[PDB]
Design a protein around this ligand. Sequence first.
Ligand SMILES: *[C@@H]1O[C@H](CO)[C@@H](O[C@@H]2O[C@H](CO)[C@@H](O)[C@H](O)[C@H]2NC(C)=O)[C@H](O)[C@H]1NC(C)=O
Ligand SMILES: *[C@@H]1O[C@H](CO)[C@@H](O[C@@H]2O[C@H](CO)[C@@H](O)[C@H](O)[C@H]2NC(C)=O)[C@H](O)[C@H]1NC(C)=O
Ligand SMILES: *[C@@H]1O[C@H](CO)[C@@H](O)[C@H](O)[C@H]1NC(C)=O
Ligand SMILES: *[C@@H]1O[C@H](CO)[C@@H](O)[C@H](O)[C@H]1NC(C)=O
Ligand SMILES: *[C@@H]1O[C@H](CO)[C@@H](O)[C@H](O)[C@H]1NC(C)=O
Ligand SMILES: *[C@@H]1O[C@H](CO)[C@@H](O)[C@H](O)[C@H]1NC(C)=O
Ligand SMILES: *[C@@H]1O[C@H](CO)[C@@H](O)[C@H](O)[C@H]1NC(C)=O
Ligand SMILES: *[C@@H]1O[C@H](CO)[C@@H](O)[C@H](O)[C@H]1NC(C)=O
Ligand SMILES: N[C@@H](CCC(=O)O)C(=O)O
Ligand SMILES: N[C@@H](CCC(=O)O)C(=O)O
Ligand SMILES: [Ca+2]
Ligand SMILES: [Ca+2]
Ligand SMILES: [Cl-]
Ligand SMILES: [Cl-]
Ligand SMILES: [Zn+2]
Ligand SMILES: [Zn+2]
Ligand SMILES: [Zn+2]
Ligand SMILES: [Zn+2]
Lengths: 689, 689
Amino acid sequence: SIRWKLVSEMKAENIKSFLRSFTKLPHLAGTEQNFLLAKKIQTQWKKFGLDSAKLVHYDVLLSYPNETNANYISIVDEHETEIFKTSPPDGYENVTNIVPPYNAFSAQGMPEGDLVYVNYARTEDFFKLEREMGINCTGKIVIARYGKIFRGNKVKNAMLAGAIGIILYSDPADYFAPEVQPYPKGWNLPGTAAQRGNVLNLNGAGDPLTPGYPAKEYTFRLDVEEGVGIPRIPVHPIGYNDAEILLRYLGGIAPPDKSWKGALNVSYSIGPGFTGSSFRKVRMHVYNINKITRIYNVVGTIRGSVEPDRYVILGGHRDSWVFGAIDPTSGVAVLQEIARSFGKLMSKGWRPRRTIIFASWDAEEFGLLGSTEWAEENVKILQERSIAYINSDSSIEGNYTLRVDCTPLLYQLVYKLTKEIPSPDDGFESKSLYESWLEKDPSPENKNLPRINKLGSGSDFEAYFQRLGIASGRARYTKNKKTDKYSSYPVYHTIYETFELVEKFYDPTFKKQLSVAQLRGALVYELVDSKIIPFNIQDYAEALKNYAASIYNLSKKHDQQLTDHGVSFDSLFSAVKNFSEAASDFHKRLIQVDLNNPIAVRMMNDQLMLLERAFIDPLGLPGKLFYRHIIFAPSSHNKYAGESFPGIYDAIFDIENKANSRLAWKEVKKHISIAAFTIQAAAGTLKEV
Amino acid sequence: SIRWKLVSEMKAENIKSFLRSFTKLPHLAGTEQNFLLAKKIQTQWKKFGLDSAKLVHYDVLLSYPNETNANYISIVDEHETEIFKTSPPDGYENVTNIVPPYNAFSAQGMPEGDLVYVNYARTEDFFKLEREMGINCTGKIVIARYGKIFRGNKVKNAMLAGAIGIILYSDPADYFAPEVQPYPKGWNLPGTAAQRGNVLNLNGAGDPLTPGYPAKEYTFRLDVEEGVGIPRIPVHPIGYNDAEILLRYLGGIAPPDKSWKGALNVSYSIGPGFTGSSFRKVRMHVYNINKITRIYNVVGTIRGSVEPDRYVILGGHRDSWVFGAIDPTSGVAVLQEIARSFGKLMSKGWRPRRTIIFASWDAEEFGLLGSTEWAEENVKILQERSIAYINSDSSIEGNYTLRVDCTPLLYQLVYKLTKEIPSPDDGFESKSLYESWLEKDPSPENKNLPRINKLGSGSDFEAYFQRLGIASGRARYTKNKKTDKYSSYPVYHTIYETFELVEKFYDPTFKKQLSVAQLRGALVYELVDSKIIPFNIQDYAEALKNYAASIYNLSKKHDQQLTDHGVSFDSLFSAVKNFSEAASDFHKRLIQVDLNNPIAVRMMNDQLMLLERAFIDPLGLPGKLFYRHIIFAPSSHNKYAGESFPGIYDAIFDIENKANSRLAWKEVKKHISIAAFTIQAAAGTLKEV
Ligand SMILES: *[C@@H]1O[C@H](CO)[C@@H](O[C@@H]2O[C@H](CO)[C@@H](O)[C@H](O)[C@H]2NC(C)=O)[C@H](O)[C@H]1NC(C)=O
Ligand SMILES: *[C@@H]1O[C@H](CO)[C@@H](O[C@@H]2O[C@H](CO)[C@@H](O)[C@H](O)[C@H]2NC(C)=O)[C@H](O)[C@H]1NC(C)=O
Ligand SMILES: *[C@@H]1O[C@H](CO)[C@@H](O)[C@H](O)[C@H]1NC(C)=O
Ligand SMILES: *[C@@H]1O[C@H](CO)[C@@H](O)[C@H](O)[C@H]1NC(C)=O
Ligand SMILES: *[C@@H]1O[C@H](CO)[C@@H](O)[C@H](O)[C@H]1NC(C)=O
Ligand SMILES: *[C@@H]1O[C@H](CO)[C@@H](O)[C@H](O)[C@H]1NC(C)=O
Ligand SMILES: *[C@@H]1O[C@H](CO)[C@@H](O)[C@H](O)[C@H]1NC(C)=O
Ligand SMILES: *[C@@H]1O[C@H](CO)[C@@H](O)[C@H](O)[C@H]1NC(C)=O
Ligand SMILES: N[C@@H](CCC(=O)O)C(=O)O
Ligand SMILES: N[C@@H](CCC(=O)O)C(=O)O
Ligand SMILES: [Ca+2]
Ligand SMILES: [Ca+2]
Ligand SMILES: [Cl-]
Ligand SMILES: [Cl-]
Ligand SMILES: [Zn+2]
Ligand SMILES: [Zn+2]
Ligand SMILES: [Zn+2]
Ligand SMILES: [Zn+2]
């Protein structure tokens, strides 16, 4: 088949050669090297035979350290004397423009005060501090370990708790795998290395200065003081050698339980303040600058021969913090090999039914900026014509098994395709990727199916799925959750994401990366070439039944309050029942369509394409204009995680502590009502008459 | 042709018989008689052969007088003694449930104070009072004449000026045509009759309690105190015999110029307060009740034979204030004759290409409620599938010539069809409706074309056009603007809208009403049956050039401020130029489409259908979530009038009086930028690649 030709043409050695060629130098967004990398990708796409390959630019707010006013954290004594001040990989000694560690979009400032340790700065950590531990973070500098949640959530939470600065650090508990040596001898994080990353709270907005509209040359810009999501306190990241020094002499209360203690040889006492030391106060000194900077997406096409006005997007970012050999450049290499394989099909006369859009996004590391600005520019055509969005970010975050996150529409296609892709895993040499994935990560809701996760955020599908309602999916290799307890991977967002790390420690044969390229490309192929779009709406019906049971179950502890305030889930369960009936009826009619009647086929394909769109509410979610999907949103507590029925979940979260119970329960009733309507409206789009 | 069979089958005598049958009794929304009228229409549609004819209900907030606490206005002396208190047509003496005059959704209250006359309570009238005349309306009861603008705008303006109540009255200057006798001898307004009507400021919201979502049984409802658009002061309407008594002894300043003087034998002095009289203070006593009440739309279909998933809607309201023989029942009679004629085509084997949706809306008089709630219920299918909405409200507001209001997409079709409809006008017996319309109302922008107006609001197309972006149009007979200076028509919204009024004074032969039925039906036919949707996008390009010139011209008096604040219209003119090029290119390709290739035709029809949608911004306009069209919105000063580039217009309106000039000019820059983007995005939807 053509699909088999596409998959079998892809080669591990080509992905290896692309990855080596793209990881010799840093390629930070907005810098010359990342523009050169865009031009290299564009030249390659033209060689591969794509119909178009254009640079599309925007001028967006980015953030960089000031080369002549370096950031640092210090400890001073009571005489204001500085007692302590916080401070390339082998083969890269001559690389001169590695950006020093910082947290992009930090406020500027030089706050000084007592230090308080806040664990992971999660919502439950700050609840514990205020409600159980007697700690008031107002006016304090807080120190938080990285991990568990998106770092911009930590900064939001610290600001809500009243902190005047937050120091982020990498605890070995979270970034040092047991019995692995630090880079370069192994793949662990050395104590000298800090994790970069932005600390915005954009909630889907894109460029901070231009929410809603693409950041073109003429575009209106908010004043920078009003840029969306920009934090109002300084934030800076340090490695664990420096953090150990800051934590060692903290006094005050002991850590409240083992879940607050990391792995350093310190007490993990909370503060505020020091004991047993010259150590008196902590200062931060953070002077990153925010500047409007040009970014460049590469956007290419293969136009459809039958339905050129229908799109499948394969998009992945290419900007990195340093070399980014895993994040994103492993995905950049996969995307080039997928485009090369589609080019080889074209060289033998093939053309897809629908149009493929290839996209290499810029400034993802600064808040999904290039992908979101392109969505904002092209929203009218994208929302009326897009079948699906397949991401192409990091392909290799671990070497254990596959991880897939996608809308329920795509479950059956994912399972189908993984059965036809050879497994790359040791011991599975005559078996499919589906077989090894099922053995290694079975779904909690059905032991005979591999686990597929909900979509959250933190990569470039966000605007497509959560704002525009375009069915989306992502797939990559990952670690074993049962045995590997570190967050992300040890060297994430550090200088040590090198080609050598990937080849020596993650995937020497490049077979695991190859299997990811084959699955991402095969997904695009099936979506773009199949006469009937390969979605299954009965899987969505089943997913809604699960989510409705889950939110109802979370309500049970409030049963008396539901009764007293006249709150019922009946309308939500009724809408889900109606949706299930409509989805069953729709599939019964779909198998009857006359495949030789192009309008009959197009009408049913439009119902398949527009079903995800029905869940999009233009009014958005409370306080979040750009999260419009009523079934899924990024968790308010952790942008990386997806939350189901987010309007209901957020209304009932911590409800027992709301000042006004009558008002709080009416908010729960509002979001139940909106979810019921939205599901019923979605069901209505499937109806025959 | 089939079109000629549709048009020629319609008969003046059938419209007359329908109108007589629907105007014998009042049919106020939410009352038994208007539910019976829905059932009568449904039975008729089934007889005519429609595929479906269903009642679709909602439970919405309505407002009615309290039968046991009647409303009134009084004058009291300084001893609190009431000195004056304000207080069926021939053949209708036995009709028992005529609603007394009131303004639906008035606040309740019994305010007492000095009276001030405020002319038409327009924005410019209150500017004149405060800025030129030295009058402070804070704490006053104001008295305003009806006319010029929507009455809910008057109430909004009075509330902003600080009034504690507003009395509305019908001045003969505005509702008594010269040398015409009052009803029943002629068609003029008697001095005893008051004009009913709602005084909400909904801005497109629909039912006050359920903005965004259809008002179903399970739906969340705002508390009534927070219902959208409900005024916070009492409002009540009176006839001119009563108003003359209230105005006669007003003292204080003389009327400032002749434009403030009406036609009563009083001075038109402004107040506050009285002179020359027992007349000391005015009181209002208004105790209407707001109640959730069931309403019923009738929704029917004729399903398309080729594209059943594409819709043309023919919708008109049927609720009235009393008998409503002009408003809306003349349109109700037209809609039945159109549906009957489509049924006759079906009886000979015809079926349309696309689906026709017929709709008889309820509660239009209470804020477009039935049409807007149905749009909110069905938004997902309507926004993806609707070609157009044709209204069927009043057909006969005067007897001079045609008036058409529609999107530029529809101009060429309207002109085309009117050439093929016989003119009903005396002296035009062998000529077309186009010919008589052109002679009587030539367009100011092109003397060789009849005038077509922009869409504003005040009837049921509003949600379809201004919220959802579905091309809309309306047509009706109207008065001669050059010679007839009264507002609306004299007996508008009074008890005297009777069948006898229409037959004796407006259109005895029913030929003018017939010509309106033929044009509304022919529009539906062409939109629903033509293989290529009959829109012209080059007419839209021309309209945008006109609107861009107009808003730029309004800016000229602020030239120095544009320079000082760095405001430019360049991006707007650039987007309009790009749109014109894209529209020309699109029509060049459209004439080349292979009419025998169904997917090629459907792709181009989708571009025609989705073009109006490109102008819809889900973020809405400032303070108005439900006005989303960037090119048109109802004027902020008069809901009945359409305004072009409303975001820019409202930002620059009265800008010289804004407290903070820097902030005000940045708002103008924001809306110019949004308009430029939106037009460029619309152009992008037309592009081939
Ligand atoms: C699911 O569909 C059912 C059947 O159409 C709807 O049930 C109606 O519910 C209303 C109350 O909302 C009752 O007044 C009707 O009598 C019901 N009709 C039945 C059971 O045949 C139900 O409302 C729909 N659910 C939603 C959320 O729209
Ligand atoms: C209309 O189309 C033109 C041509 O594509 C756009 O012109 C570009 O304008 C930007 C500034 O916005 C310049 O940087 C480019 O050099 C222009 N290219 C030209 C003239 O070929 C113009 O921006 C579009 N208008 C809008 C509102 O998008
Ligand atoms: C960088 O810091 C130096 C030293 O404080 C300062 O003079 C300069 O303005 C800073 N640069 C920017 C772009 O703010
Ligand atoms: C925390 O400290 C601040 C400032 O010293 C004070 O305003 C606030 O009341 C305290 N709040 C608590 C303990 O919740
Ligand atoms: C890669 O797989 C090998 C073999 O199972 C294992 O020893 C190694 O730890 C894995 N690497 C990472 C980075 O997990
Ligand atoms: C109508 O007015 C009477 C007299 O004030 C009052 O008793 C009654 O409650 C009112 N009805 C409603 C529905 O408010
Ligand atoms: C109008 O009168 C009110 C109340 O008496 C007063 O508060 C206000 O300052 C006055 N405002 C004017 C003349 O603008
Ligand atoms: C109807 O037309 C006749 C003849 O021109 C005219 O006398 C009459 O005033 C018109 N009626 C109305 C209500 O304008
Ligand atoms: N993927 C980047 C950016 C995510 C975001 O800004 O949403 C990170 O996790 O740091
Ligand atoms: N057509 C009615 C209702 C209009 C509206 O509420 O927008 C009137 O003008 O009174
Ligand atoms: Ca933007
Ligand atoms: Ca509603
Ligand atoms: Cl990915
Ligand atoms: Cl109308
Ligand atoms: Zn990434
Ligand atoms: Zn990253
Ligand atoms: Zn009407
Ligand atoms: Zn009316």
